Every structure is written in C-alpha cells, then in structure tokens.
Amino acid sequence: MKDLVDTTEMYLRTIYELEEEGVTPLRARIAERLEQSGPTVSQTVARMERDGLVVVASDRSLQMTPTGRTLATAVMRKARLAERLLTDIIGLDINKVHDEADRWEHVMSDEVERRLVKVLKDVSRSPFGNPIPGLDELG
Template sequence: MKEIVNTTEMYLRTIYDLNEDRVPVRQSRLIERMHQAAATVFHTVTRMKRAGLVSIAEDNLIELTDPGSIRAIEVTRKHRLAERLLTDVVNMPTTLVHGEASRLQHVMSEEAERRIVDLLGGPTTSPWGNPIPGLEHFGITVESTVAATKLADLPESTLPVAGVVRSISEHAQSDPELIRFLVNAGVIPGARVTIRPNGKSYAVRGLDEIELPKKLAHIIDVDCTSTSSNISAFN
C-alpha cells in the first residue's frame, strides 16, 4: 500500500510540475518524466482516474480533479519545504536537494511541515525559486511575486535581451547532468543572464555561455525588467 501511495504522489507532483511548466499533460509526457514503461503509466493513470484524482479529456489531456489538485499541492508543498530545510539548515549542496526531497515528501507529516515553516520564518519559494503552494494552510499570506517569463515565451523580436533568472523548473532539477550544467554556467536563480537566439537553441550566458535547446526552454523563468544578481546562496 505504501508503494502505491508513493507512486500516486509522484504522479500527482509530476502532473503539477507539467502544469507549472505549461506543458500539456499526456501519457507520453508522463512516460518521459517518470522514466517508466507505457503500460505502467497507463495502469497508474487508470487507477488514479478510478480514485477520482484525475480526469481524461477528449483530446487525451490528463487533468487534476479538485481532490487531485489538493493532494498535488500538498505533496509539492512538502517537497519544496524539504528542499528549503536541506539547503537552509542541513547545508546540503543545492544540486542534491531535489532527489533527497523527493524521498522526504512521502514521510513528512503536517506537523513537521508546520515546524519547518516556523523554523525557516515562512519561506515562500524553493531554493530554485519555485513558489511553495498551499502555504495559506499554515496562515501564510504570499505576496505577489516578481513578474517573470518562461524563456520559451520570450518573443524572438525582443532578443537578444538581458534579465535575471527567477526560477529553474522541477524538470531540470530531476536531471543531475542538466542541473550541474546550469549551475556550473551560473544560470541559477538570482543570476543576471543574457539570452540570444541561436537556431534551434538559445545561447544563455551567465558566468559562461551555454546552448539550451528550445525544447528545454520551459525550464527557466526570467525577469527581463531587472538586472540585479545574487548567486551566493548556491553551492
């Protein structure tokens, strides 16, 4: 039963992440992100549909139901609070916290969440700049965040452009090689970057210049109205 619960929570969080990235949620995307066989994904999604956690639209889009959304927010909140605890208190390198938090999210109680929130003074974002959802459950009012645009949504007519990285998506964090690639280049939350188109890629310069394929342009949110930077929090 515990394995089923953990699997369901991972799927719920992955669907939440896809929605956050504004990527259409279909079984093909879950196969890609969960690194599971098509049959496994089909059976898991079918089980979640029977449980009332997801619905499947006529165009095969997978959508969270109201109960599914509540649970997805809860597990995402646990995950991102665990990441903050690991970076802010345990001093774990930022590149390692995603995997560890993915394990802790399944065993963290609501009381533990509440104590982490109190201990850290009510954090509102993960170490990677992603908003921690559902904090109103603990009486925290989240002020509006700084406007940011996904790299994928920047009109090419506005490029090249300078801006500040606001967040790196969970998709990138789950790929150790990709996240090290970004960190080593200084393409991290708070860092000032310049962006220019380069064929099927974007040339993104932080400390060094990297080529980011356009198919991964959803992983970075950038604020092109600011030029401040702060990279000292990253290890």
C-alpha cells in the same frame, strides 16, 4: 519500497510541474520524466481515475480532480519545504537536494511542515526558484 516511494503522489507531482511550465499534461510526458513504460503509466493513471484523483480528458490531457489537485499541492508543499530545510539548515550540497526532497516529500507530515514554516527564515519559494504552494491550506 519502490524508487518513487509513493507512485501516485509522483504522478500528481509530475502533472503539477508540467502545468507550472505551461506544458500540457499527457500520460506520454509522465512516462518520459519518470522513466516509466507507457503501459505502466496507462495502468497507474487508469487506477487514479477510479480513485477519483484525475480525469483523462477527451483530448487525452490529464485533468486533476479538486481532490487530486489538493493532494498534488500538498506534495509540492512538502517537497519545497524539505528543499528549503535541506539547503538553509542542514547544508546538504544543492546538487543532492532535489533527489533527497523527492523522497522526503512522501513521508513528511503536515505537523512537521508547520514547524518548518516557523523555523525557516522564509518560505516564499524553493531553492530552485518555484513558489511554495498550499501554505494557507496547510492546516
């Protein structure tokens, strides 16, 4: 099992987050926050294209296809719902919540999410301040 658990999903999560912070999505920036080499990033992104999940634009910025964006959104949703579960119910020290959720986000089923929406007091945003996306699509 790779440290990122699901490589492709982590590249999409990265692109998503860069967008959230008004940062242009560049392969160069993915390598930086995921601590992966350039060729490695270049190869993965290349595969994501043939898979139809992202497009390397003329300016070389990364443009997620609608299907790429749907998957990325669901990964963010699972992560933030996990972060909420880990904080609100399990009581995991906040300093460990991000890394834990970073792994769980890749194995959480839509079904468990639905349950978390019903059990959690509120799913407006994650414990770190960001809005929990895709709630309406969840289903």
